[PDB]
Amino acid sequence: KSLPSYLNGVMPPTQSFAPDPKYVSSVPCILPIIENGKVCSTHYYLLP
């Protein structure tokens, strides 16, 4: 009943609302935080 049907309950990473102009915008430098090998996977460096 308007619930999403997925194969075996599995979500895809994303779902597209294209070509709706409210969701389509009509590429900066993101770096992880790593002290050996990621002490935090939710935050990143944001540079120009």
């Binding site: 997925y6 994303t14 597209s16 969701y23 993101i30 935090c40 939710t42 990143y44 944001l46």
Partner: protein, 282 residues
């Protein structure tokens, strides 16, 4: 109205967490002419400019004054070489952990009430002219499973009299919770908080899933521009999902307002089973 604490007044018993902001402690507070109060102690570790310290303080004065069930009051502050925010301990912990660990003890009623409670708290802060800038399920805390609270780890901003925007300087930032204009332009507004409310809400309904799972944060701004957004949760009817999605409109002013979010989720919360279909919750 904001209590300045001496270092003698309080001690850190245990570490509870770390991150970009710094470190959270289990702690004990003894006010001066007294009772021991179990507290959390957040130690901010960013080497602050004058600009940065003034901004934290101003945020702190506001947080000290809050009187709303759904927002944590700043009990005190200890400035030295580091800022330490002292706040009432929440032993139940954060909401992200709860929904991951206690999925089976969560029905539609709990979930939509959490949504309302967070909206109410976030609206309260918007009336206080505070851009929170860090809403995630990793920063909503459980007082009790019926009652949840928003907190800050020093990153919120008070907007001056004729300011709509806050322009951040660069830092460590939660890309997958951020509105697109905060990534491209580092602009933070009450409406960018709305975006992050949506993501918060997605996390709840997916019982703690990692958003955009398997897509590196480096690619996020692209897929957003192309119209890709977080998928519809398995338990969600279309009515709920469409509310979440409207928070991720490109035009920030066109997104819902926390006011509307309260009214909307509050209606749904009077007939929860209509709007969230959860196994065994019938």
């Amino acid at each position: 109205l904001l209590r300045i604490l001496k270092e003698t007044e309080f001690k850190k018993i245990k570490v509870l967490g770390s991150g970009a902001f710094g470190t959270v402690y289990k702690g004990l507070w003894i006010p001066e002419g007294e009772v021991k109060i179990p507290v959390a102690i957040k130690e901010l570790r960013e080497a602050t400019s004058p600009k940065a310290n003034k901004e934290i303080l101003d945020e702190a004065y506001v947080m000290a004054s809050v009187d709303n069930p759904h927002v944590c009051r700043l009990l005190g502050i200890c400035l030295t070489s580091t800022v330490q925010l002292i706040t009432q301990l929440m032993p139940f912990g954060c909401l992200l952990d709860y929904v991951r660990e206690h999925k089976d003890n969560i029905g539609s009623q709990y979930l939509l009430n959490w949504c309302v409670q967070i909206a109410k708290g976030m609206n309260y802060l918007e009336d206080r002219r505070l851009v929170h800038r860090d809403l995630a399920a990793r920063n909503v805390l459980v007082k009790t499973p019926q009652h949840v609270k928003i907190t800050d780890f020093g990153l919120a901003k008070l907007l001056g009299a004729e300011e709509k925007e806050y322009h951040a300087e660069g830092g460590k930032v939660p890309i997958k919770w951020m509105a697109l204009e905060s990534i491209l332009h580092r602009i933070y507004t009450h409406q960018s908080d709305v975006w992050s409310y949506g993501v918060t809400v997605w996390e709840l309904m997916t019982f703690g899933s990692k958003p955009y799972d398997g897509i590196p944060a480096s690619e996020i701004s692209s897929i957003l521009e192309k119209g890709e957004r977080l998928p519809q949760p398995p338990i969600c009817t279309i009515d709920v999902y469409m509310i979440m999605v409207k928070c991720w409109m490109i035009d920030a002013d066109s997104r819902p307002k926390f006011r509307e979010l309260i009214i909307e989720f509050s209606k749904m919360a009077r007939d929860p089973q209509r709007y969230l279909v959860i196994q065994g919750d019938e």
